[PDB]
Design an enzyme around this catalytic site. Structure first.
Site, PDB file in Angstrom:
ATOM      1  CB  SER A   1      -0.988  -0.109   1.167  1.00 20.73           C
ATOM      2  OG  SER A   1      -2.097   0.769   0.976  1.00 20.73           O
TER       3      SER A   1
ATOM      4  CG  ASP B   1      -6.734  -2.137  -3.362  1.00 22.38           C
ATOM      5  OD1 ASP B   1      -7.306  -1.364  -2.564  1.00 22.38           O
ATOM      6  OD2 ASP B   1      -5.506  -2.361  -3.297  1.00 22.38           O
TER       7      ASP B   1
ATOM      8  CG  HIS C   1      -5.567  -2.231   0.268  1.00 27.24           C
ATOM      9  ND1 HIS C   1      -4.879  -1.771  -0.836  1.00 27.24           N
ATOM     10  CD2 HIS C   1      -4.979  -1.662   1.346  1.00 27.24           C
ATOM     11  CE1 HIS C   1      -3.921  -0.953  -0.444  1.00 27.24           C
ATOM     12  NE2 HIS C   1      -3.954  -0.880   0.879  1.00 27.24           N
TER      13      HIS C   1
END
Ligand code: CA
Ligand code: ZN
Ligand code: ZN
Ligand code: ZN
Ligand code: ZN
Ligand code: ZN
Ligand code: ZN
Ligand code: ZN
Length: 262
Positions: free
Chosen positions: A134, A180, A212
């Site tokens: 991320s 995501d 995610h």
């Protein structure tokens, strides 16, 4: 084989060996204090056997609000394939991608310069890599602009508002998650991939239906190609080109893009 490359480690690979939860090396650990300069500490995973030579290293960053525990499973899974793996914590859980990239580099500099001698005697300090999740994956991209001498970069479901990465010349493997909603692949992962040079060895793998936090859970599809990427580019090990080129066709993959052959 080893006659053609002094960095090759482990037996000749197979689809099974890159899918295995452990490679051929046993793994030891070493914790690093948050008072380490330039980042927030973490955990070093490293191979125990020294009979085949020294190893490359990959620093691994977490995402926004997250800590190294979100990334812990890469430690023994990847280090057992013959790598020093450093799962790090950031200075604060709210650090941004540029900061995470600086901290990936500060953590690699720790391995080269300040780490315990059991780690340093097993480290090739010239063969280093970055990976992260991320915002930590955005930091992976950042780190390769900051340090073009890195050997590989793996942004995992990456988040970054900076979408233009034409300066990156470190071989980069982006993994996106189809579902995501935190870092949508249409506005993060895929624009990043498309902006990397067309001349760069690069790949994009989109995991079908994944969300995610897919990279924070042991995932054989992630693991096998993270391992193959690090092998091919940190160790220059062309024995792993067979898994990267032609493009993987795993049922778990919605879409794969590459600049194969390499
Ligand atoms: Ca610190
Ligand atoms: Zn060889
Ligand atoms: Zn051995
Ligand atoms: Zn363990
Ligand atoms: Zn930035
Ligand atoms: Zn930029
Ligand atoms: Zn898609
Ligand atoms: Zn799908």
């Amino acid at each position: 084989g080893p006659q053609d490359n002094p960095y090759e480690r482990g037996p000749d690979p197979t689809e099974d060996s890159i899918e295995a939860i452990r490679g051929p090396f046993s793994v030891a650990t070493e914790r690093v204090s948050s008072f380490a300069s330039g980042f927030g500490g973490g955990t070093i995973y490293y191979p125990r056997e020294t009979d085949e030579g020294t190893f490359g290293a990959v620093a691994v960053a977490p995402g926004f609000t997250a800590s190294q525990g979100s990334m812990s499973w890469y430690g023994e899974r990847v280090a057992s394939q013959g790598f020093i793996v450093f799962t790090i914590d950031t200075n604060t859980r709210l650090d941004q991608p540029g900061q995470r990239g600086r901290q990936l580099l500060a953590a690699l500099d720790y391995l080269v310069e300040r780490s315990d001698r059991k780690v340093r005697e097993r480290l090739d300090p010239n063969r280093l890599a970055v990976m992260g999740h991320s915002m930590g994956g955005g930091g992976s991209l950042e780190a390769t602009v900051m340090r073009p001498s890195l050997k590989a970069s793996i942004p995992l479901t990456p988040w970054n508002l900076d979408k233009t990465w034409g300066q990156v010349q470190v071989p980069t493997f982006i993994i996106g998650a189809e579902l995501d909603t935190i870092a949508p692949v249409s506005t993060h992962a895929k624009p990043f991939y498309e902006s990397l040079p067309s001349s760069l060895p690069k790949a994009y793998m989109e995991l079908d239906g994944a969300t995610h936090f897919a990279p924070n859970i042991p995932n054989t599809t992630i693991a096998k190609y993270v391992i193959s990427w690090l092998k091919r580019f940190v160790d220059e090990d062309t024995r792993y080109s067979q898994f990267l080129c032609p493009n993987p066709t795993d049922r778990a993959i919605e879409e794969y893009r590459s600049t194969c052959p390499y």
